[PDB]
Antibody, heavy 218, light 215 residues
Framework: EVQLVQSGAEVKKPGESLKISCRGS????????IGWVRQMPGKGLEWMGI????????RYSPSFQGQVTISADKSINTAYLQWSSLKASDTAMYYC????????????????WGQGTLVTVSSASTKGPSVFPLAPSGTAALGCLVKDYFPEPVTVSWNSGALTSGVHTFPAVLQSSGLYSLSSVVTVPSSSLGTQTYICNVNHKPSNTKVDKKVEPK | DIQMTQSPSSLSASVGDRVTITCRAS??????LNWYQQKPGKTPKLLIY???SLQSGVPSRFSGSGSGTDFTLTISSLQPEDFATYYC??????????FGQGTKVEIKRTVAAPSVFIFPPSDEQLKSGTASVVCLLNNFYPREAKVQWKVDNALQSGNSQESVTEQDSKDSTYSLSSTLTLSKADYEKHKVYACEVTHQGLSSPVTKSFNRGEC
C-alpha cells in the first residue's frame, strides 16, 4: 500500500559530505510529514526532525539542529537527509517514517517506515579479509576466522551452501585498528572429520575478495 | 524536555505467557504515547497509538493502557513471532519527540550449559606477526556468560573481544565467540593458553586449554 524506500548503504570518511534519500509511494507525498530517526550500533531510536514536503516546512530536534539538513523534492516524491561534514560518530542506521498526523498533533504516530540506510563513517580504507582456520581438535567444532576487513559486510557459507545445519556466523567486532573481524563455526559428528570435506566460502564485495578455505584436523 | 524510561531492559517468557512492559514519562503526556516493535536488523513497526488504540492489522493480543506519566503494553499470550524489542515513544512534546530505550522480549527455555571449544592461532597467521586465539561457547541458555582468558595462569583483560548470536529460532539458545589477540612475540613467550567459562548451567567453571606447540 503505502511504501517508503530508502537509498542503499553508505561508507564515507570523516569530513566528507553525504545525502541519503527516502522515496514515498502509494499516497499523497505532499499531504504528510516525513520524519528521520537515528539508530547507532546496538542502541535505541532517536528522533532527528520532520519536513512537510508540500512547502518544505521543517522542525529539528534541538540535538540535531545545525548538524543535518532535511529537504524534499516533491516532484519525485523524495525526502533527503544531509551532512556537510561527517564524523565517525555519525555511524548509524537512519530511518525515514511517515507521520500520521492531520493538522497539529491530535495523535502523530509514525505509521509507515523505510527499510533503513546504513551509514559507516571511518578513517579506515577498503581492505579484504584474511581467512584463517579454526581447526577441529561425539561432536566436534571447526570454523574460519575472517580477520581484518573493511567495510561491512562479509558473507560466509559452508561447502558452497550444502552445509547449513549447526552453522553459527557471528556478528563482526570492530577492532581498535578500525578493521572488522568475524568468525564462522559449525559443529559436526566427530566421525566425519576423516572423510567429509569442510570448506568455508568467504565473499567481501567492497574489496572484490573471494576466498575458499578448507579446514581440517591438524 | 520529556524523558521516557522503559522498565525491564529485558524479559524472558515462553510462548503462551502474559507479558507487561512499562514506560514512564518525566512529564505528563496525556495519552500521546505510541508503541513500536523491532526485530534485529529490521524496520520498526507501529503496534499501539494514543496509549491504547490498536493499529490496523495488529493482533488483538496486544493492548495498552495508561495516561499522564505511567503506561503499559501488554501481550496477553505470547506467540513465537512476538519475540522482539519494543519501544515506547511520546508525541506530546512540542520540542522533541522521544523514545524509551527499549525492552527486549526473548524466549525462556530450560537452562543449557555451553559446549566449549578452544582454537590455537594458525601457522599462517603467526607468519604475519599476530596471534588470534578463539574460544567458542555453543548453544547455551540464558545468554549471560563469562569468558576468562588465562595465559600461563595470568588473567587477561583488555586484549579480547566477543560476539553473541541472536537467539536461535529453533532451539532458543545463544552462542558466543571470544578472540584473544597477542603479538607473535608475546604468543611465543608463553606456554598454556586457557579459556575458562562461567555460566549458570555449569556447577563450576569449565576450562579448555592447549599448550603452544603440542599436537
Amino acid at each position: 500500500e503505502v511504501q517508503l524506500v530508502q537509498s542503499g548503504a553508505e561508507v564515507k570518511k570523516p569530513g566528507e559530505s553525504l545525502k541519503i534519500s527516502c522515496r514515498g509511494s502509494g499516497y499523497s507525498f505532499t499531504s504528510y510529514w516525513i520524519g528521520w530517526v537515528r539508530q547507532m550500533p546496538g542502541k535505541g531510536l532517536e528522533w532527528m526532525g520532520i519536513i512537510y514536503p508540500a512547502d518544505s516546512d521543517t522542525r529539528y530536534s534541538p540535538s540535531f539542529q545545525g548538524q543535518v539538513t532535511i529537504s524534499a523534492d516533491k516532484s519525485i516524491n523524495t525526502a533527503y537527509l544531509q551532512w556537510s561534514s561527517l564524523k565517525a560518530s555519525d555511524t548509524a542506521m537512519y530511518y525515514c517514517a511517515r507521520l500520521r498526523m492531520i493538522g497539529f498533533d491530535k495523535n502523530a504516530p509514525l505509521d509507515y517506515w523505510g527499510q533503513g540506510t546504513l551509514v559507516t563513517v571511518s578513517s579506515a580504507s577498503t581492505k579484504g579479509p584474511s581467512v584463517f582456520p579454526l581447526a577441529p581438535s561425539g561432536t566436534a567444532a571447526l570454523g574460519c576466522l575472517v580477520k581484518d576487513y573493511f567495510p561491512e559486510p562479509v558473507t560466509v557459507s559452508w561447502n558452497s551452501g550444502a552445509l547449513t545445519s549447526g552453522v553459527h556466523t557471528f556478528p563482526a567486532v570492530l577492532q581498535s585498528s578500525g578493521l572488522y573481524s568475524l568468525s564462522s563455526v559449525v559443529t559436526v559428528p566427530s566421525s566425519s572429520l576423516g572423510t567429509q570435506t569442510y570448506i568455508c566460502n568467504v565473499n567481501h564485495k567492497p574489496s572484490n575478495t573471494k576466498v575458499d578455505k578448507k579446514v581440517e584436523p591438524k | 524536555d520529556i524523558q521516557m524510561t522503559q522498565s525491564p531492559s529485558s524479559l524472558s517468557a515462553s510462548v503462551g505467557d502474559r507479558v507487561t512492559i512499562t514506560c514512564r514519562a518525566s512529564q505528563s503526556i496525556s495519552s500521546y504515547l505510541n508503541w513500536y516493535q523491532q526485530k534485529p536488523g529490521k524496520t520498526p513497526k507501529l503496534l499501539i497509538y494514543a496509549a491504547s488504540s490498536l493499529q490496523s492489522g495488529v493482533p488483538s493480543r496486544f493492548s495498552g493502557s495508561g495516561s499522564g506519566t505511567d503506561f503499559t503494553l501488554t501481550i496477553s499470550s505470547l506467540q513465537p513471532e512476538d519475540f522482539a524489542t519494543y519501544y515506547c515513544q511520546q508525541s506530546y512534546s512540542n520540542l522533541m519527540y522521544s523514545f524509551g530505550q527499549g525492552t527486549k522480549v526473548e524466549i525462556k527455555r530450560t537452562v543449557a550449559a555451553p559446549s566449549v571449544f578452544i582454537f590455537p592461532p594458525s601457522d599462517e597467521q603467526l607468519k604475519s606477526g599476530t596471534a588470534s586465539v578463539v574460544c567458542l561457547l555453543n548453544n547455551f541458555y540464558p545468554r549471560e556468560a563469562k569468558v576468562q582468558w588465562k595465559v600461563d595462569n595470568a588473567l587477561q583483560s583488555g586484549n579480547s573481544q566477543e560476539s553473541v548470536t541472536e537467539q536461535d529460532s529453533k532451539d532458543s539458545t545463544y552462542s558466543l565467540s571470544s578472540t584473544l589477540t597477542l603479538s607473535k612475540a608475546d604468543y611465543e613467550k608463553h606456554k598454556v593458553y586457557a579459556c575458562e567459562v562461567t555460566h549458570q548451567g555449569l556447577s563450576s567453571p569449565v576450562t579448555k586449554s592447549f599448550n603452544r606447540g603440542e599436537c
